[PDB]
Amino acid sequence: RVQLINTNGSWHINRTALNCNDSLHTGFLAALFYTHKFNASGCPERMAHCRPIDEFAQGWGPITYAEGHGSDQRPYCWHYAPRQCGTIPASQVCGPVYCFTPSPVVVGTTDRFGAPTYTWGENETDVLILNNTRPPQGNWFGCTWMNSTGFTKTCGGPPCNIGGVGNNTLTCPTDCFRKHPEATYTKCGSGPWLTPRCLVDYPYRLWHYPCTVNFTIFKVRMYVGGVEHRLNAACNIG
Amino acid sequence: DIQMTQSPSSLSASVGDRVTITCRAGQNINNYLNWYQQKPGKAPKVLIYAASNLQSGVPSRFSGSGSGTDFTLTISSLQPEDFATYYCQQSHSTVRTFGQGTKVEIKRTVAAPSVFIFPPSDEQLKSGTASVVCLLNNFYPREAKVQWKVDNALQSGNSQESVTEQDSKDSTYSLSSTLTLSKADYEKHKVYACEVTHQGLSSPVTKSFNRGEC
Amino acid sequence: QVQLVQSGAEVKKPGSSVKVSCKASGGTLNSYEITWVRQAPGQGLEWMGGITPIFETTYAQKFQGRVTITADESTSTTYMELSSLRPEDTAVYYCARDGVRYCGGGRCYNWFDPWGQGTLVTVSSASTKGPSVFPLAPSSKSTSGGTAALGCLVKDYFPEPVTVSWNSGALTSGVHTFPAVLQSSGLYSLSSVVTVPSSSLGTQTYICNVNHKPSNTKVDKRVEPKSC
Ligand SMILES: *[C@@H]1O[C@H](CO)[C@@H](O[C@@H]2O[C@H](CO)[C@@H](O[C@@H]3O[C@H](CO)[C@@H](O)[C@H](O)[C@@H]3O)[C@H](O)[C@H]2NC(C)=O)[C@H](O)[C@H]1NC(C)=O
Ligand SMILES: *[C@@H]1O[C@H](CO)[C@@H](O[C@@H]2O[C@H](CO)[C@@H](O[C@@H]3O[C@H](CO)[C@@H](O)[C@H](O)[C@@H]3O)[C@H](O)[C@H]2NC(C)=O)[C@H](O)[C@H]1NC(C)=O
Ligand SMILES: *[C@@H]1O[C@H](CO)[C@@H](O[C@@H]2O[C@H](CO)[C@@H](O)[C@H](O)[C@H]2NC(C)=O)[C@H](O)[C@H]1NC(C)=O
Ligand SMILES: *[C@@H]1O[C@H](CO)[C@@H](O)[C@H](O)[C@H]1NC(C)=O
Ligand SMILES: *[C@@H]1O[C@H](CO)[C@@H](O)[C@H](O)[C@H]1NC(C)=O
Ligand SMILES: *[C@@H]1O[C@H](CO)[C@@H](O)[C@H](O)[C@H]1NC(C)=O
Ligand SMILES: *[C@@H]1O[C@H](CO)[C@@H](O)[C@H](O)[C@H]1NC(C)=O
Ligand SMILES: *[C@@H]1O[C@H](CO)[C@@H](O)[C@H](O)[C@H]1NC(C)=O
Ligand SMILES: [Br-]
Ligand SMILES: [Br-]
Ligand SMILES: [Br-]
Ligand SMILES: [Br-]
Ligand SMILES: [Br-]
Ligand SMILES: [Br-]
Ligand SMILES: [Br-]
């Protein structure tokens, strides 16, 4: 973070995929170097698209998992259901990839057989092996990165089916025990969103979720099948 | 600061030809080099970034190459709408430096100027100053020598030349040559002549009027 | 989607100073990588200096001490101030965005996009003055075939620029409006000529409309053939 570009012109972490291309004039790439200069005046409109959890219908019955893959949009909303993580090629990734255990961890670039590689993802065969199963058995709940053209991509889970289907159904990818008493994070968490109003704080949150510069940072406590987790969440309360 | 040298300064090329513009950097700048195109009367727009990457919307005819100190810009097959001045610019230092620029022009068949001379208007003669305008319409190439004679005396110092950019359709130029004398001197002499020498003229063409006749 | 809008043109006497503003809006930063470059008439590009989003300035070798670049994030306006103006600083001053826009091979690259519309700054002793518009009347000495040439002499004005239309805009084809030439007097001058059907001389009226906003001058000069 000290000097994002080292003395030799290159990005300071060479295990980071750095294939960025700001061809749509969104200025997401300048925000990479000046992230506290983010212009927040569009946030009230972008965040108005997300509905609070109390707007959602009560769930019931036993909980199953999400294999539908419906045309969902807007990963910046907490209720976004993602698809399960797989391997993604470095050619489409711009910046560090963080996965959430719920605690944040970075997945450097590797070759297809998992050996580490160190060329900022310029090889067309470099990948980021993000395949996830939910811990304690697995590794992490979900991941979040930025693609070349500047869109927040995210994966993980799969999310949960809490009962009902249609207009106002909540496919829970976080702790939704408000709507289903078994919809805990460990059962249903699929990434950084710890509650409908908290996401995990990590060094690039403000770049991947810039309309959360707003949020207050709370020390929170997560229990994942025994192993106690003490991590920082950025929550929207006021 | 890093000195960028461009080569050449001016270039005339036929349509469909291939044009090679060199930029040489003072020191190693790796590939931190952009190419701007500038049409006259408008701001420059980038066409190639990072030595060799074609900006969006730019025809594949343009192409950049080179790393370190020697950089070239290549237009494979020149087109009528590629007329402009082209600038290279290093982005290796925070203090940005430009090249001297390469203006490119459409070569075409030699064309001869039509020469017209206008005596000064009666209104301007009333003001005390007299301007004689000699006009060369629609010629190529640009090089043209205009020489005013007044009562067979060769003028010097009292005339100013102005030339248009290439014409969009026919690629020709037009020039004006304005000779400026005081009313007292203009009313003194009789024969105002404008002698034009141009490659497309077999002889130097001379346009002449006698003061006071219409 | 960001837009840079520079201030209007400026006329300054030698020795004084000018402050060109460049306001950015409609983007994803509150302050931008703002860079400055000028270009004298007919001349090449000259880089002057830039300022980072966190307001760190860099300047070129030949302008330091003379140029100062400031910012104001409330209006997202960048300012460029050049002092000890000389005749040779007559130029069009551009501001542009020099932000990062491509990263590859572990390196990231900046270039100028978008650009502002420009600011003309003239540095002379002259004082604002409107043009004298004289006809260049058609004659036998300007016919050549079925055509005939006529025009307007636009003389002794300052500063730039002038616009010149014909028949209020109804005549646009076959027009050559020559680039202005700075006269020794310090006043500019150009000529605007048009070619027309010679069989229209005497029945079709030709008027050139010369406008010079710096002096609130609008001239309509009738161009009629020499009749004697
Ligand atoms: C970076 O992420 C964005 C958003 O995920 C990517 O844009 C998306 O690209 C896909 C694949 O082309 C688009 O889906 C396709 O749309 C076309 C119609 O345009 C349709 O005919 C296809 O059947 C398919 O559904 C998707 O619409 C598009 N979404 C957005 C918001 O632009 C972008 O491609 C990614 N860039 C890179 C370099 O990976
Ligand atoms: C950054 O993104 C831009 C825009 O998406 C990339 O530009 C694209 O570059 C490809 C290179 O092959 C162009 O393909 C070419 O298409 C033309 C037809 O116009 C064809 O004649 C060529 O043989 C080639 O197939 C593509 O047109 C171009 N897209 C646009 C709309 O500009 C750019 O490559 C990306 N930058 C980097 C360094 O990856
Ligand atoms: C910060 O973002 C806001 C929201 O997009 C921008 O506000 C818009 O600006 C454009 C251009 O000035 C106007 O036409 C819109 O009407 C504005 N809309 C709103 C929501 O007010 C603002 O310009 C951006 N600011 C900066 C510093 O670039
Ligand atoms: C420094 O940059 C040069 C030029 O790109 C490169 O050859 C060299 O390998 C780099 N230094 C390192 C990290 O070895
Ligand atoms: C970059 O990779 C090289 C070679 O694998 C390694 O020596 C270097 O330490 C890496 N970058 C940093 C700053 O650690
Ligand atoms: C964040 O901004 C949103 C949209 O303007 C608003 O709904 C929310 O209350 C803000 N968060 C705070 C101040 O806690
Ligand atoms: C990981 O995901 C990739 C891409 O979907 C897939 O090819 C690979 O088989 C997966 N590996 C495991 C062990 O899940
Ligand atoms: C790309 O990866 C392959 C296989 O790991 C390797 O042999 C090759 O040298 C790499 N090339 C580059 C450009 O790093
Ligand atoms: Br932009
Ligand atoms: Br910052
Ligand atoms: Br698979
Ligand atoms: Br967001
Ligand atoms: Br040098
Ligand atoms: Br320069
Ligand atoms: Br910027």
Which residues on A lie below 8 Å from C105 (Cβ)?
119-120, 122
CA of C111 to the centre of ligand 2 (A): 18
Q: Rounded to an integer, what distance in angstroms lies between the CA atom of residue A158 and that of residue A96?
A: 22
Contact between C53 and A37 using a beta-carbon 8 Å cutoff: yes
Which residues on A lie below 8 Å from C107 (Cβ)?
5, 9-11
Give the distance from residue B162's alpha carbon to the nearest chain C alpha carbon, in angstroms: 6
Tell me the HSE value of C19 on the side-chain side, using a 13 A CA sphere: 7
The residue contributing the CA closest to ligand 5 atom 4 is A118
Report the 10 Å Cβ neighbour count for C160: 17
Whether a cis peptide bond, with omega within 30° of 0, leads into A136 is yes
Query: C121, A24 in Cβ contact below 8 A?
Result: no
Q: How far is CA C27 from the centre of its chain?
A: 27
C175 vs B12, C169, C171, CA distance in Å?
A: 25, 11, 8
Whether a cis peptide bond, with omega within 30° of 0, leads into A102 is yes
Q: How far is CA B171 from the centre of its chain?
A: 11
Specify which residues C23 forms β-bridges with: C5, C77
Specify which residues A230 forms β-bridges with: A221
Q: Rounded to an integer, what distance in angstroms lies between the CA atom of residue B191 and that of residue B207?
A: 10
Reported structure resolution in angstroms:
2.9
Q: Rounded to an integer, what distance in angstroms lies between the CA atom of residue A79 and that of residue A54?
A: 12
Choose the final residue of a domain: B43, B77, B107.
B107
Query: B197, B145 in Cβ contact below 8 A?
Result: yes
Q: Rounded to an integer, what distance in angstroms lies between the CA atom of residue A90 and that of residue B138?
A: 57
Q: Which helix (H) or strand (E) holds C87?
A: none
Query: B138, B174 in Cβ contact below 8 A?
Result: yes
Q: Rounded to an integer, what distance in angstroms lies between the CA atom of residue A122 and that of residue A126?
A: 7
Place of tokens 């080099």: B33
Which residues on B lie below 8 Å from A23 (Cβ)?
56
Report the 10 Å Cβ neighbour count for B17: 14
Q: Rounded to an integer, what distance in angstroms lies between the CA atom of residue B131 and that of residue B142?
A: 24
| B62 & B148 share domain | no
**What's the first-to-final CA gap in chain B, in angstroms?**
62
**What's the first-to-final CA gap in chain C, in angstroms?**
62
Query: C94, C116 in Cβ contact below 8 A?
Result: yes
Choose the final residue of a domain: B51, B86, B107.
B107
| B123 & B102 share domain | no
Q: If you ran DSSP here, which 8-state letter would residue C88 be given?
A: G
| B50 & B88 share domain | yes
- Chains touching C (3+ CB pairs < 8 Å): A, B
Specify which residues C21 forms β-bridges with: C79
| B157 & B122 share domain | yes
Q: Which of C185, C194, C196, C125 is nearest to C155 (CA)?
A: C185
Query: A16, A121 in Cβ contact below 8 A?
Result: yes
Q: Rounded to an integer, what distance in angstroms lies between the CA atom of residue B147 and that of residue B195?
A: 5
CA nearest B172 in C: which residue? Answer: C176
Given the CA of residue A237, which atom of ligand 6 is nearest to it? 14
SS3 for C96? Answer: strand
| B46 & B89 share domain | yes
Query: C67, C48 in Cβ contact below 8 A?
Result: yes
CA nearest B32 in A: which residue? Answer: A9
Contact between C103 and A119 using a beta-carbon 8 Å cutoff: no
SS3 for C135? Answer: strand
C102 inside 8 A of chain B by CB: yes
Q: Kindly state the tokens that stand for B211.
A: 């003061």
The four Cα atoms B138, B143, B148, B154 give a dihedral, to 10 degrees, of: -160
Instruction: Name the closest ligand to CA B30.
Output: 4
Q: Which helix (H) or strand (E) holds C212?
A: strand C206-212
SS3 for C181? Answer: coil
The residue contributing the CA closest to ligand 5 atom 2 is A118
CA of C29 to the centre of ligand 15 (A): 7
Q: Which of A47, A5, A46, A34 is nearest to A196 (CA)?
A: A47
C227 inside 8 A of chain B by CB: yes
The residue contributing the CA closest to ligand 3 atom 23 is C26
What b-and-e string marks burial along B125-154, b requiring 16 or more CB atoms within 10 Å of the CB? beeebbbbbbbbbbbbbeebebbbebeeee
Q: Rounded to an integer, what distance in angstroms lies between the CA atom of residue A149 and that of residue C10?
A: 41
Parallel/antiparallel/unpaired status of strands B10-13 and B102-106:
parallel
A124 vs A89, A96, A120, B149, B163, CA distance in Å?
A: 8, 17, 11, 73, 54
Q: Rounded to an integer, what distance in angstroms lies between the CA atom of residue A191 and that of residue A66?
A: 15
CA of A80 to the centre of ligand 12 (A): 12
| B85 & B37 share domain | yes
The four Cα atoms C115, A3, B25, B42 give a dihedral, to 10 degrees, of: 0
Q: Rounded to an integer, what distance in angstroms lies between the CA atom of residue B201 and that of residue B146?
A: 13
SS3 for C3? Answer: strand
Residue B175's domain spans which residues?
A: 108-211
Which residues on C lie below 8 Å from B178 (Cβ)?
153, 181, 189, 191
The four Cα atoms B42, B44, B46, B48 give a dihedral, to 10 degrees, of: 110
Tell the burial category of C75 from Cβ atoms under 10 Å away from its Cβ (0-12, 13-18, 19+).
Answer: exposed
Q: If you ran DSSP here, which 8-state letter would residue C46 be given?
A: E
SS3 for C200? Answer: helix
- In chain C, where the domains are located: 1-125, 126-228
What is the 3-state secondary structure of chain B? CCCEEEECCEEEECCCCCEEEEEEECCCCCCCEEEEEECCCCCCEEEEECCCEECCCCCCCEEEECCCCEEEEEECCCCHHHCEEEEEEECCCCCCEECCCEEEEECCCCECCEEEEECCCHHHHHHCEEEEEEEEEEEECCCCEEEEEECCEECCCCEEEEECCCCCCCCCEEEEEEEEEEHHHHCCCCEEEEEEECCCCCCCEEEEEECCCC
Q: Kindly state the tokens that stand for A135.
A: 């811990």
Report the 10 Å Cβ neighbour count for C99: 25
Q: What is the CATH number of the domain that holds B158?
A: 2.60.40.10
* Strands (DSSP E) found in C73-205: 77-82, 91-97, 100-104, 107-110, 119-123, 132-136, 147-157, 163-166, 175-177, 188-197
What is the 3-state secondary structure of A182-227? CCCHHHHCCCCEEECCEEECCCCHHHHCHHHCCCEEEEEEEEECCE
| B189 & B98 share domain | no
Q: Kindly state the tokens that stand for C190.
A: 């150009």
Place of tokens 């920082």: A232
Query: A69, A75 in Cβ contact below 8 A?
Result: no
In the CATH scheme, what is the code of domain C126-228?
A: 2.60.40.10
Q: Rounded to an integer, what distance in angstroms lies between the CA atom of residue B46 and that of residue B50?
A: 11
Residues with C-beta atoms within 5 A of ion ligand 13? B 2-3, 26-27
Contact between C99 and A39 using a beta-carbon 8 Å cutoff: no
Q: Rounded to an integer, what distance in angstroms lies between the CA atom of residue B140 and that of residue B161?
A: 16
SS3 for C38? Answer: strand
Q: Rounded to an integer, what distance in angstroms lies between the CA atom of residue A128 and that of residue A96?
A: 10
Specify which residues B160 forms β-bridges with: B178
Query: B122, B212 in Cβ contact below 8 A?
Result: no
Q: Rounded to an integer, what distance in angstroms lies between the CA atom of residue A152 and that of residue A142?
A: 13
- Interface test mutation site (partner C, options A4, A14, A21, A25, max chain C beta carbons within 10 A): A25
| B121 & B60 share domain | no
A137 inside 8 A of chain B by CB: no
Q: Rounded to an integer, what distance in angstroms lies between the CA atom of residue A65 and that of residue A52?
A: 22
Q: Which of C76, C99, C58 is nearest to C68 (CA)?
A: C58
A9 inside 8 A of chain B by CB: yes
| B129 & B83 share domain | no
Q: If you ran DSSP here, which 8-state letter would residue C30 be given?
A: S
SS3 for C61? Answer: helix
Residues with CB under 6 A from ligand 2: A 21, 23; B 53, 56, 60; C 104
Choose the final residue of a domain: B107, B142, B168.
B107
| B124 & B39 share domain | no
Chain breaks in chain B (C to N over 2.5 A) after: none
Ligand 1 binding pocket includes A148 (Cβ within 6 Å): yes
Q: Rounded to an integer, what distance in angstroms lies between the CA atom of residue B35 and that of residue B57?
A: 14
Using only C-alpha atoms, what is the Rg of chain C?
A: 23
Parallel/antiparallel/unpaired status of strands C217-223 and B102-106:
unpaired
Residues with C-beta atoms within 5 A of ion ligand 14? B 97-98; C 47
Structure determination method: X-ray
Query: B137, B174 in Cβ contact below 8 A?
Result: yes
Query: A65, A158 in Cβ contact below 8 A?
Result: yes
The sign one gets for the Cα dihedral C97, C101, C107, C111 is: negative
Tell me the HSE value of A68 on the side-chain side, using a 13 A CA sphere: 13
Q: If you ran DSSP here, which 8-state letter would residue C129 be given?
A: B
Specify which residues B78 forms β-bridges with: none
Query: B76, B163 in Cβ contact below 8 A?
Result: no
Question: Position B95: which residue type?
Answer: V
Q: Rounded to an integer, what distance in angstroms lies between the CA atom of residue A174 and that of residue A185?
A: 5
| B17 & B99 share domain | yes
Given the CA of residue A147, which atom of ligand 1 is nearest to it? 1
Q: What is the DSSP string of chain A?
A: ---SB-TTSSBS-TTS-B-EE-TT---HHHHTT-GGGB--TTHHHHGGGSPPGGGSPP--S--EE---------TTSTTPPPPPP-EEEGGGBBS--EEESSSEEE---B-TTS-B--STT-STT-EEE-----TTTSS-SEEEEEBTTS-EEEEES--EE-S--STT--EESS--TTT-TT--HHHH--SSEEETTEEE--TTHHHHSGGGTTSEEEEEEEEETTEEEEEEEEE---
**Residues contacting residue C76 through CB under 8 Å, at least 6 positions apart:** C23, C24, C25, C30, C31, C32
CA of A222 to the centre of ligand 8 (A): 41
Give the angle subtended at the CA of C172 by the CAs of C169 and C175, to the nearest 5°: 125
Specify which residues C129 forms β-bridges with: C158
Q: Rounded to an integer, what distance in angstroms lies between the CA atom of residue A157 and that of residue C142?
A: 84
SS3 for C211? Answer: strand
**Residues contacting residue A116 through CB under 8 Å, at least 6 positions apart:** A15, A108, A109, A110
A232 vs A154, B57, B190, C31, CA distance in Å?
A: 20, 45, 96, 29
Q: Rounded to an integer, what distance in angstroms lies between the CA atom of residue A103 and that of residue A200?
A: 7
Q: If you ran DSSP here, which 8-state letter would residue C177 be given?
A: E
What b-and-e string marks burial along C165-195, b requiring 16 or more CB atoms within 10 Å of the CB? bbeeeebeeeebbbebebbeeebbbbbbbbb
